[PDB]
């Protein structure tokens, strides 16, 4: 290997070690699911007759459980948590949607997610997405309304159990 | 960007900065060409009637001048120097080849290149290659004999002139 290859190898280890302080993907997924509950509860309490549940579909559950890929680490090392998907009982009107979106905004900001967008906002479809700090919170309604959250990248607890300064096998 | 992407971006800068201490590709290429001269001179002095020159072909000269790619950095940032190619006047017998190869070995070791190999060694073709520490020294003879040397990866002087801790544009 030349020097650039040797150093990049050292840097794989350093990258992992620098992420140890963040805690595990497993803890993050738990906490993000709690945050989804908080948002859904506040949304339901702000909006007359709105209800919610965690999606009970067994393959949605497995998919959320598995998480999403990190940008620069493989799935055996680190993953981005996906909070258990939230399904709302009723669709939102335009006014109620703005209320719910404000609640999502308030909670997302606590995670450093403050960059806002909407692919559309009408009877046909309503979308509110806010990202930042590697998090993404999305309230999307086409035929029915959902809340989803994906977190930043976290090392799996099995990597955290590896001594620091070592390449994971 | 997620955390892995943010950190990998930081690490590009760190990689470059950690290579500053090595000096420039331009200096390394000069020094490696001097080493090729040293080897060629010692070879010619050990072997009766052997002569050498730097290859005078203008496109060989340009190719050597341009160098080789580093493993993990682009050619606008760092390159591996290639010493001006050496062409020997006469071909080597088997005995003279072992003598010349021993001289290459002695000089290569000063650069940390000590891992030896030969793709063949006969009237038809004689090859002696020694590598290590990102260097490669090769004495190859098919129809005529050459000496080539490629060095480890070095930052271009233009990158060394950039203040440390900054991404090259």
Sheet holding B78-80, edge to edge: B68-69, B78-80, B154-155
CA distance A97 to A102: 9
Q: What is the DSSP letter of B82?
A: B
Counting one residue from chain A and one from chain B, the pairs whose CB atoms sit within 8 A come to: 73
* DSSP three-state, residue B80: strand
B3 contacts in A (CB within 8 Å)? 19, 22, 70, 134, 152-154
Q: Which of A3, A14, A67, A82 should we substitute to test contact with B (largest number of B Cβ atoms within 10 Å)? A: A3
Can you name the CATH fold of A1-169?
Answer: TBP-like (3.30.2030)
| Residue B96 per-residue DSSP state | H
> Of B77, B79, B75, B81, nearest to B12 (Cα)?
B77
- For residue A129 the two structure tokens come to 């997405």
DSSP label at B78? E
Q: What is the dihedral of CA B93, B94, B95, B96, to 10 degrees?
A: 50
Task: Work out the number of other CB atoms within 10 angstroms of the CB of residue B94.
Answer: 10
b/e for A37-59, b at 16 or more Cβ within 10 A?
eebbebbbeebeebebebbeeee
Chain A residues with CB under 8 Å of B11 CB are 11, 14-15
User: From the list B15, B134, B153, which residue is nearest A11 (CB)?
Assistant: B15
Resolution in angstroms for this experimental structure? 2.0
Residues facing residue B52 across a β-bridge: B88
Distance CA A111, CA A38 (A): 14
Cβ of residue A20 closer than 8 Å to a chain B Cβ: no
Long-range contacts of B116-122 (CB under 8 A, 24+ apart): B121/B94, B121/B97, B122/B94
Per-domain residue ranges for chain A?
1-169
For residues B163 and B11, the answer to whether their CB atoms sit within 8 Å is: no
Enter the tokens of residue A130. Answer: 């806010």
Residues in chain A: 169
Three-class DSSP labels, chain A: CCHHHHHHHHHHHHHHHHHHHHCCHHHHHHHHHHHHHHHHHHHHHHCCCCCEEECCCHHHHHHHHHCEECCCCCCCCEEECECCCEEECCCCCHHHHHHHHHHHHHHHHCCCCCEEECCCECCCCEEEEEEECCEEEEEEECCCEEEEEECCCEECHHHHCCCCCCCCC
Burial of B118 (0-12, 13-18, 19+ CB in 10 A): middle
DSSP string spanning B108-136?
HHTTT--EEE-S-BSSS-EEEEEEETTEE
* Of residues B4, B19, B72, nearest to A70 (C-beta): B4
Alpha-carbon distance of B89 to B94, in angstroms, equals 16
| Euclidean distance between CA atoms A126 and A102, whole angstroms | 14
- For the stretch B53-92, what's the b/e string if a residue is b when 16 or more beta carbons lie within 10 angstroms of its beta carbon? ebbeeeeeeeebeebbebbbbeeebbbbbbbbbbbbeeeb
Nearest CA to B47 out of B106, B110, B8, B98 is that of B98
Cα dist from A62 to A67, A83, A145, B12, whole Å: 9, 11, 20, 36
Q: How was this structure determined?
A: X-ray
Residue pointed to by tokens 């996906």:
A82
Judge contact between A70 and B4, C-beta under 8 A. Answer: yes
Q: Which of B2, B15, B134 sits opposite A1 (nearest CB)?
A: B134
Please tell me the distance from the alpha carbon of residue A167 to that of residue B9, in angstroms, as a whole number: 20
Chain B CB contacts of A71 under 8 Å are 1-2, 4-5, 8
Rounded-to-integer distance, Cα A20 and Cα B28, Å: 39
């Amino acid at each position: 290997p030349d020097t650039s290859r040797r150093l990049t190898g050292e840097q794989k280890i350093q990258l992992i070690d620098s992420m140890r302080n963040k805690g595990s993907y497993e803890a993050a997924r738990e906490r993000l699911t709690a945050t989804a509950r908080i948002i859904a509860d506040r949304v339901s309490a702000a909006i007359p007759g709105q209800t919610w549940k965690f999606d009970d579909d067994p393959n949605i559950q497995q998919s959320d459980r598995n998480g999403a890929l990190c940008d620069k680490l493989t799935a055996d090392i680190a993953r981005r948590p996906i909070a258990n998907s939230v399904m709302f009982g009723a669709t939102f009107s335009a006014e109620d949607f703005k209320i719910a979106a404000n609640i999502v905004r308030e909670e997302a900001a606590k995670y450093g997610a403050t960059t806002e967008s909407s692919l559309f906002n009408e009877s046909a479809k309503r979308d509110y997405d806010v990202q930042g700090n590697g998090y993404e919170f999305r309230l999307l309604q086409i035929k029915f309304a959902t809340l989803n959250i994906t977190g930043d990248c976290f090392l799996l607890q099995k990597v955290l159990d590896l001594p620091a300064g070592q390449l994971p096998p």
